[PDB]
Amino acid sequence: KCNTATCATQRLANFLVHSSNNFGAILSST
Amino acid sequence: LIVAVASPVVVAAHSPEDEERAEKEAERLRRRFAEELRKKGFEVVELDEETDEELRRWLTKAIREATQAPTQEEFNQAVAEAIEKALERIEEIARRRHPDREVAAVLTVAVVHDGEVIATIFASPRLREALK
């Protein structure tokens, strides 16, 4: 599980970058 | 083709200012994607605020639940499934609102991580088919 503090945001950020790369979604970032 | 674009779902913002910053970045991404759809000739429509907020509540809860997964891979699969079910439901809702047209859907998801916004656009199966 996500036991740490930034675990939830890090997991979701990884997913968004994974979706952009491995599944061709379109990503933007500041 | 009518494409219904949901309001962005911003997840895990630490402050209202960070959430507004994430909303603006995600809205700019959605705006650029919508303009690209219209270049292809597709009509782009929006959902009502209540449906958007129900989508936000459900997808944020689904993502929160997914953080219990033991690995990134299982997290990815849980959230991908949640996004796919949310996209399918938006299509159904938009089909009932525009029953004279073929309908597709677009979901935008944003997160604030280490002071930055990351936002991503997800297209419904009918949209991906239409873009071929």
Specify the 3-state DSSP secondary structure of B67. coil
Measured distance CA(A12)–CA(B59) in Å, rounded: 12
Query: Distance (Å, rounded) from C-alpha B125 to C-alpha B128?
Result: 5
Which residues partner with A29 through β-bridges? B118
Looking at the complex, report in whole angstroms how far the Cα of residue B127 sits from the nearest Cα belonging to chain A. 12
A28 and B25: CB-CB below 8 Å? yes
User: What are the structure tokens assigned to B117, written together?
Assistant: 């916004």
Contact B121 A25 (CB under 8 A): yes
Helix (H) or strand (E) holding B95: helix B72-97
Q: What six digits make up the tokens of B27? A: 């809205």
Give chain B's domain count: 1
CB contact under 8 A, A30 and B79: no
Resolution (A): 1.9
- Of the candidates B69, B123, B27, the residue with the CA atom closest to the CA atom of residue A10: B69
Pairwise CB contact (< 8 Å): A16 & B120? yes
Structural contact between residues A9 and B13, judged by C-beta atoms closer than 8 angstroms: no
Experimental method, per PDB record = X-ray
- Write b or e for each residue in A2-14: b if 16 or more Cβ atoms lie within 10 A of its Cβ, otherwise e: beeeeebbbbbbb
| Minimal C-alpha gap between B49 and chain A (Å) | 24
For residue B108, CA distances in Å to A5, B1, B59, B118 come to 24, 19, 11, 11
Residue B18's CB: how many other CB atoms inside 10 A?
Answer: 15
Q: Which two tokens stand for residue B112?
A: 């604030």
Give the alpha-carbon dihedral of B36, B7, B91, B80, to 10 degrees: 90
- Cα B6 to Cα B28, B34, B91, B111, distances in angstroms: 13, 11, 10, 16
> Using CA atoms, how far apart are residues A28 and A30, in angstroms rounded to an integer?
7
Whole-number Å distance between alpha carbons of B62 and B49: 20
Are B125 and B105 spatial neighbours (Cβ–Cβ below 8 Å)?
A: no
User: For residue B79, what is the DSSP state?
Assistant: H
Residue B123 in tokens: 């297209």
Q: Which two tokens stand for residue B42?
A: 């597709």
Q: Which domain holds residue B29?
A: 2-130
